[PDB]
Scaffold this active site. Structure first.
Site, PDB file in Angstrom:
ATOM      1  CG  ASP A 131      52.490  40.380  45.141  1.00 15.97           C
ATOM      2  OD1 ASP A 131      53.098  39.547  45.844  1.00 15.97           O
ATOM      3  OD2 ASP A 131      51.465  40.978  45.529  1.00 15.97           O
ATOM      4  CE  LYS A 133      48.729  41.317  46.910  1.00 14.25           C
ATOM      5  NZ  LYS A 133      49.629  42.295  47.587  1.00 14.25           N
ATOM      6  CG  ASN A 136      47.588  40.380  43.056  1.00 13.02           C
ATOM      7  OD1 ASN A 136      46.514  40.952  43.240  1.00 13.02           O
ATOM      8  ND2 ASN A 136      48.762  40.996  43.177  1.00 13.02           N
TER       9      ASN A 136
HETATM   10  C1  LIG Z   1      42.335  40.354  42.154  1.00 10.32           C
HETATM   11  N1  LIG Z   1      43.083  41.583  42.529  1.00 10.32           N
HETATM   12  C2  LIG Z   1      42.191  42.689  42.929  1.00 10.32           C
HETATM   13  C3  LIG Z   1      41.636  43.396  41.681  1.00 10.32           C
HETATM   14  N2  LIG Z   1      40.289  42.868  41.406  1.00 10.32           N
HETATM   15  C4  LIG Z   1      39.925  42.361  40.163  1.00 10.32           C
HETATM   16  N3  LIG Z   1      40.679  42.574  39.064  1.00 10.32           N
HETATM   17  C5  LIG Z   1      40.332  42.090  37.859  1.00 10.32           C
HETATM   18  N4  LIG Z   1      39.225  41.370  37.665  1.00 10.32           N
HETATM   19  C6  LIG Z   1      38.385  41.087  38.692  1.00 10.32           C
HETATM   20  C7  LIG Z   1      37.168  40.297  38.499  1.00 10.32           C
HETATM   21  C8  LIG Z   1      36.795  39.762  37.165  1.00 10.32           C
HETATM   22  N5  LIG Z   1      37.218  40.366  36.035  1.00 10.32           N
HETATM   23  O1  LIG Z   1      36.098  38.771  37.085  1.00 10.32           O
HETATM   24  C9  LIG Z   1      36.316  40.026  39.605  1.00 10.32           C
HETATM   25  C10 LIG Z   1      36.603  40.496  40.890  1.00 10.32           C
HETATM   26  C11 LIG Z   1      37.875  41.328  41.125  1.00 10.32           C
HETATM   27  C12 LIG Z   1      38.721  41.596  40.024  1.00 10.32           C
HETATM   28  C13 LIG Z   1      41.554  44.889  41.915  1.00 10.32           C
HETATM   29  C14 LIG Z   1      42.696  45.702  41.740  1.00 10.32           C
HETATM   30  C15 LIG Z   1      42.612  47.093  41.956  1.00 10.32           C
HETATM   31  C16 LIG Z   1      41.379  47.675  42.349  1.00 10.32           C
HETATM   32  C17 LIG Z   1      40.241  46.860  42.524  1.00 10.32           C
HETATM   33  F1  LIG Z   1      39.062  47.396  42.900  1.00 10.32           F
HETATM   34  C18 LIG Z   1      40.330  45.477  42.306  1.00 10.32           C
END
Ligand SMILES: CNC[C@@H](Nc1ncnc2c(C(N)=O)cccc12)c1cccc(F)c1
Length: 307
Positions: A131, A133, A136
């Protein structure tokens, strides 16, 4: 040793169904990190789910690539799992689209190019991103892309075989890319429905509408990616990523430079501090940062050989 207490919570960055992401400080003292938190209680009851959750913890450890997000620490308590990631102060590519509106061709091109190397690395490792989007995808502090989602939303960017669960391969990634590209160039995903079913049925009937202002190369590429028959898509072949990158739309891209991150991003987040959070949705960043109060996740623990 690594426990939740090594970190203090500064902000809420996002909220998922099985968990949250906090901006935190290590108390590497001072360094900011993102802390992704998963409730075991929601996970261990579903086999397919713990699998996706362990797949994620393996992939993040195994892969090291400029355009995938890095795993620093990982660790667990009774009921929670903890991933410590580099903090990506560029936010989601979703918010970059909101911020600047429809992307110009050369802008769209840059992000797609980086994303294409990312997919290409993954495939070589037998990994399918499924995916693509824009939420992501994120941007590090220098404005470059980072795939960030290998764990367990909207569907518009997913490919037909994926949705109909009829069996697939890495080519669903190349469909998902052409939907991303569409969305960047037009401002909407190629098949949208007034609601869920309308949309899936629209994706299946798969009648591509190309806007008049798209270049010839942009249209051509979009045509070759957004094909129903997964075999026919550009990038389906043994070439995979190098197949897509070879297309003319990418003719200005010097790949070895791009990978080196020597190419200037189309937009630079200008942050004012290490934990500047201005690139994130305030719906989340306002909330008070609080971690709400058998074991198969044995050996979750991780420490990057770097740190
Ligand atoms: C982008 N997809 C959403 C994902 N959010 C993130 N994932 C990895 N890193 C992040 C960072 C970062 N590392 O800077 C900063 C902000 C968000 C994320 C996600 C998935 C499942 C449960 C959740 F609460 C959040």
């Amino acid at each position: 040793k690594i426990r939740p207490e090594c970190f203090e919570l500064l902000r809420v960055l996002g909220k998922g169904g099985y968990g949250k992401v906090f901006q935190v400080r290590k108390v590497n003292t001072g360094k900011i990190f993102a802390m992704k938190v998963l409730k075991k209680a929601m996970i261990v009851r579903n086999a397919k789910d713990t699998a996706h959750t362990k797949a994620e913890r393996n992939i993040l450890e195994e892969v090291k690539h400029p355009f995938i997000v890095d795993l620093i620490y990982a660790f667990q308590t009774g009921g929670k799992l903890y991933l410590i990631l580099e903090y990506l102060s560029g936010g989601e590519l979703f918010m970059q689209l909101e911020r600047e509106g429809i992307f110009m061709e050369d802008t769209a091109c840059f992000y797609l190019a980086e994303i294409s190397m990312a997919l290409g690395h993954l495939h070589q490792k037998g990994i399918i991103y499924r995916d693509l989007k824009p939420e992501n995808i994120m941007l590090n502090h220098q404005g470059h892309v980072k795939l960030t989602d290998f764990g367990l939303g909207t569907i518009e960017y997913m490919a037909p075989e994926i949705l109909m669960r009829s069996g697939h391969n890495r080519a669903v990634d190349w469909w998902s890319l052409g939907a991303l590209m569409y969305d960047m160039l037009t401002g909407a995903p190629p098949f949208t429905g007034e609601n869920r079913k309308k949309t899936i049925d629209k994706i299946l009937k798969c009648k591509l509408n190309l806007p008049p202002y798209l270049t010839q190369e942009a249209r051509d590429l979009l045509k070759k990616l957004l094909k129903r028959n997964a075999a026919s898509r550009l990038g389906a072949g043994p070439g995979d990523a190098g197949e897509v990158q070879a297309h003319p739309f990418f003719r200005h891209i010097n790949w070895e430079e791009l990978l080196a991150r020597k190419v200037e991003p189309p937009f630079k987040p200008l942050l004012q501090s290490e934990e500047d959070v201005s690139q994130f949705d305030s719906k989340f960043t306002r909330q008070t940062p609080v971690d709400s109060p058998n074991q198969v996740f044995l050996g979750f623990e991780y420490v990057a050989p770097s740190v």
